[PDB]
């Protein structure tokens, strides 16, 4: 905080001297990566006649009488050395360098590209591009200091830079994979008169303009389905959803992909989802043999096994479990395993996750879900009491879901009435039901969180994968 | 509502007969546009041996004894005729067609591609893909009925389909224009502990997980600037912002582009913005001679004039107006023109919009703004009392803004303290100021609303350009 005071004094002194420590422009000719790419093998201790204008954050300084060295680091982490020499710039210029420049300062330098006894610019000219009032921390940054000051994390930790660029490359890879298949990206409302399309409690805000509460969307699904009714063949939306969470490690704001494809079933969207994930790994990561932080390697290449929920649970419990199995039977199994109340569907999913889910290692689709827990998904084409839903588990993590969508408006109203009754202490989404009543062609939806994808591919947590986590 | 009851009866009858009016799948081989593209000139009244599976919404029907014709319309508005003939399908099939199929119903038909005495499929086979419980309206759709039921608007009005696809093509064109220049797209928070980076009242919501109010972002600007400090060279974010409006025709939710570029000034971002807009028109519209709904044509090709606010206002008022001109002088001019209170900057902008702004027709940049109204923009490099801001007016509409960004953390704190004092009845964004104190390289930001862009290019209002406007 004394170092704060001295940097603040240098700013005021620089101003007073008619020097400008926040100039509007410096004439930067090249990024440092550009200069590096244009001199891959310069014979050591040799000079060239490529004059450049570079700019960079001084991350290392090493002074003497007649010659000061610094490492400039460009924003991407590329480095170039500058040398401030009595012979080439003023004695005044050299003294100003020594008096004026601190670690963290952004500096412009103009000069000739050379190699040292290390690629360097021997300066004719330099100025401050931006005076840092706070010194950089060093081996001096806690996990939650990183998240409270991502801007400092990105300056000092190369891994923060690579994670930031990987998320961007992953999101781009997804847009590329879907646009190549003819998906159009749509923008549906964030503020809704009622938030539907998932199981979660909404955030409420007061509209001045309508003197009512509006709800931040929990999911785009009901609006994307209106797009299907409207004649979109292939649609997706990649954007924030909001779940007002209470005792939770799941973030209240997170980026979600949803896709809808007409004249396909959950079987089709299962294939597309595998291909999309494999294409994202190829584009953004460069391999399907994923390196993890424990030094392990997770293979997502080839075909992925599919299992059914009721059969795989039957095999794990050693008895036949079906959509007919009573709640009292299932409650007794749950008790025997040491586990708003008891529902057939909720018990099937809980016992499945507890017995089969925890065991899964290779990438696996589980399909054919209980009707009670899948209000928006079509009843199975041949199997009584299940719906056409899959969940994809990749490296143990619940990653993605796909459905053969319910288009029958009368079944859909019944399912919403069941839900409305069950949480009564009861208005339905009548506009959504109205859209289904105009006719929705058969279609398949998917959902996949971007942070879950990055975690499944890399082992990084939500606190590493989102630029600016809540705090 | 009787037509509702009859459609509902046909659904129940179809179910009872073991027929499925919402089948999970039909085997569609081709889109209708595909079939059209594969038979551009079939000699009229001739048969081919291309069997197809098509599916489409029956938008026109014309029945007889032995032969029923229908127009299927694919989601994109492409049409193909089907012919249901006693000779090729059952007598039973023909009667079921007549009894079972209504306008708005989605129907699959399998058969041979032929031309009529008009491109058609002569059916071997048909089924319902989705039974419509509500008939389509016709010349029967009010402007706010269109917006309350966009899904019906997209079915019946080709222009709704073309506007929906144009917005998507414009947003894609922008991503393409910025990615081609090396801009990375980032995701910054929507929910903030305090909403900054623009002049507007925020929406508030209660966090359960933190028992505090959070604020929906009014702008990404302060987080994008943290990205610049963090070493991003070129960043953009294309996403919703939220302004809690009261007496307003400006929407509470709207999609905004912001871009930031290091080592450029407002002069650089002015060029990029023109090029970006011209590239968007080229990609999404196909011309720079923009057709408007009044039949007029607006030319956005070539170079755009730039004017300065103080000089252009001086010429319009017939006296020299400068950053020194007093509020009392300006108040008197405002009165003479028949116009939380009186500020020098607010009066300059109001008199400029009233005298020069209203006159502009050709695309025009106005630059060099009053310091009081531009708290985040750098003081001008040579002109005392103005900031490096431009506003672009295109076809009379205020479209876009660009700034030479303020990086001086001490000037920035002063400007925030001025604002905080002026609305006191006073906490600053200390984390944002902290980021500037680590050092932000010189950079230029822009802002441009997607609905304003579409309006400036097309003459369409916000109620036409957003898929699902609030209602
Ligand atoms: N709305 C779902 C994703 C789409 C699944 C298919 N309709 C969710 O929040 O998980
Ligand atoms: N935050 C500005 C846009 C960016 C202008 C350059 N910093 C706005 O809401 O208009």
From Swiss-Prot, chains A, B:
E.C. numbers: 6.1.1.6
Co-factor remark: Binds 3 Mg(2+) ions per subunit.
Enzyme class: ligase
Any one Gene Ontology BP term: lysyl-tRNA aminoacylation
UniProt keyword annotations, A-Z: Aminoacyl-tRNA synthetase, ATP-binding, Cytoplasm, Ligase, Magnesium, Metal-binding, Nucleotide-binding, Protein biosynthesis
Molecular function as annotated in GO: ATP binding; lysine-tRNA ligase activity; magnesium ion binding; tRNA binding
Pfam family, one: tRNA-synt_2
Binding site for Mg(2+) 1: 391, 398
Reactions catalysed according to its record: tRNA(Lys) + L-lysine + ATP = L-lysyl-tRNA(Lys) + AMP + diphosphate
Subcellular location, record wording: Cytoplasm
UniProt-annotated binding residues for Mg(2+) 2: 398
More about this protein: There are two lysyl-tRNA ligases in M.tuberculosis.
Family from the record: Belongs to the class-II aminoacyl-tRNA synthetase family.
Subunit (UniProt): Homodimer.
Name of the protein: Lysine--tRNA ligase 1
Gene behind this protein: lysS1
């Amino acid at each position: 905080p004394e170092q704060f005071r001295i940097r603040r004094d240098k700013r005021a002194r620089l101003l007073a001297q008619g020097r400008d420590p926040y100039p509007v422009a410096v004439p930067r000719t090249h990024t440092l990566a550009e200069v590096r790419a244009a001199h891959p093998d310069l014979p050591i201790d040799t000079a060239t006649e490529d004059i450049v204008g570079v700019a960079g954050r001084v991350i290392f300084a090493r002074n003497s009488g007649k010659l000061c060295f610094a490492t400039l680091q460009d924003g991407d982490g590329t480095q170039l050395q500058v040398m401030i020499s009595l012979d080439k710039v003023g004695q005044a210029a050299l003294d100003a360098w020594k008096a004026d420049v601190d670690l963290g300062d952004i500096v412009y330098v103009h000069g000739a590209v050379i190699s040292s006894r290390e690629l360097s610019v021997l300066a004719d000219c330099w100025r401050i591009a931006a005076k840092s009032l706070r010194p950089l921390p060093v081996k001096e940054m806690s996990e939650e200091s990183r998240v409270r000051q991502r801007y400092v994390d990105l300056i000092v930790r190369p891994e923060a830079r690579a994670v930031a660029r990987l998320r961007i490359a992953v999101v781009r890879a997804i847009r590329t994979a879907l646009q190549r298949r003819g998906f159009l990206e749509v923008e549906t409302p964030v503020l809704q008169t009622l938030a539907g399309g998932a199981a979660a409690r909404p955030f409420a805000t007061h509209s001045n303009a309508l003197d009512i509460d509006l709800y931040l969307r929990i999911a785009p699904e009901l609006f994307l389905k209106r797009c299907i009714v409207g004649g979109f063949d292939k649609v997706f939306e990649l954007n924030r959803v909001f779940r007002n969470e209470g005792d939770s490690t799941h973030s209240p704001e997170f980026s979600m992909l949803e896709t809808y494809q007409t004249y396909g079933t959950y079987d089709d969207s299962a294939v597309v989802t595998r291909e999309l994930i494999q294409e994202v790994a190829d584009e953004a990561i460069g391999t399907r043999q994923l390196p993890l932080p424990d030094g392990s390697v997770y293979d997502i290449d080839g075909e992925w096994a599919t299992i059914q929920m009721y059969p795989s649970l039957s095999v794990a419990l050693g008895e036949e479990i079906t959509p007919q199995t009573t709640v009292d039977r299932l409650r007794g199994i749950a008790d025997s395993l040491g586990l708003r109340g008891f529902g057939h569907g909720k018990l099937i999913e809980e016992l499945w996750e507890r017995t089969v889910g925890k065991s899964l290692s290779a990438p696996t689709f589980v399909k054919d879900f209980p009707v009670q827990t899948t209000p928006l998904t079509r009843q199975h084409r041949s199997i009584p009491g299940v719906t056409e839903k899959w969940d994809l588990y990749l490296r143990g993590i619940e990653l993605a879901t796909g459905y053969s969508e319910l288009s029958d408006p009368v079944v859909q109203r019944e399912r919403f009435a069941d839900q409305a009754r069950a949480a009564a202490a009861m208005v339905l989404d009548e506009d959504f039901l109205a859209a289904l009543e105009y006719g929705m062609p058969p279609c398949t939806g998917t959902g996949m969180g971007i942070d879950r994808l990055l975690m499944s591919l890399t082992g990084l947590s939500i606190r590493e994968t989102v630029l600016f986590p809540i705090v």
